Design a protein around this nucleic acid. Structure first.
Length: 184
DNA sequence: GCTATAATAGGGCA
DNA sequence: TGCCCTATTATAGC
């Protein structure tokens, strides 16, 4: 009823941001922390990681923080919360302001090969397929505004969503098309 | 471990 | 001002 295709895209990566609302001393965090990495000349953030939920945090001097790698939105907020407390314990008056899911990446397998060239040709205003550069067809759906990477194998990557239902809807919108161009 | 995709954050530079 | 800096993640042919 929500997934007429019978297939449910698996969530693979969630990118979120949160505002710790306090400037941070990155050199102090990098020295005091254990799971930290800081190379100012390369990137302006402290890169930290935890095991559960398995994620990576990018902590900036401004107090802003990016959390990547989680398998769900809840897992992403949970992870972000642990990093916030890690930073709190380090001495800073960190809070958890304006948490937001910025991107959801999902993937699935329709279990049948696809004729990418024919698909791109019939949907040129939406498709970008150049095998010699990247083996996947880049499908830029407008409603919802989502990008799908369609491979000959039947495997699909769906990215750009800020709510999981967009991920699901884009896949459901694309399913009938993939079937039309099933490789025989 | 590069190719390409989305999204975020910051310093640095043409 | 734009854009790459970095890390994430599925995918696949090089």
């Amino acid at each position: 009823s929500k997934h007429p295709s019978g297939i449910v895209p698996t969530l693979q990566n969630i990118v979120s941001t949160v505002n710790l609302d306090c400037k941070l001393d990155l050199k102090a965090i990098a020295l005091q922390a254990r799971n930290a990495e800081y190379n100012p000349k390369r990137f302006a953030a402290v890169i930290m990681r935890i095991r559960e939920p398995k994620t990576t945090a990018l902590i900036f001097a401004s107090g802003k923080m990016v959390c990547t790698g989680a398998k769900s939105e809840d897992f992403s907020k949970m992870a972000a919360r642990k990093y916030a407390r890690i930073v709190q314990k380090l001495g800073f008056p960190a809070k958890f302001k304006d948490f937001k899911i910025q991107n959801i990446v999902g993937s699935c397998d329709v279990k049948f090969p696809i004729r990418l060239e024919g698909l791109a040709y019939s949907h040129a205003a939406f498709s970008s397929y150049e095998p010699e550069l990247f083996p996947g067809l880049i499908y830029r759906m407008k409603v919802p505004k989502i990008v799908l990477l369609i491979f000959v194998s039947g495997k699909i990557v769906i990215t750009g969503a800020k709510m999981r239902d967009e991920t699901y809807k884009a896949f459901e919108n694309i399913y009938p098309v993939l079937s039309e161009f099933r490789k025989i």
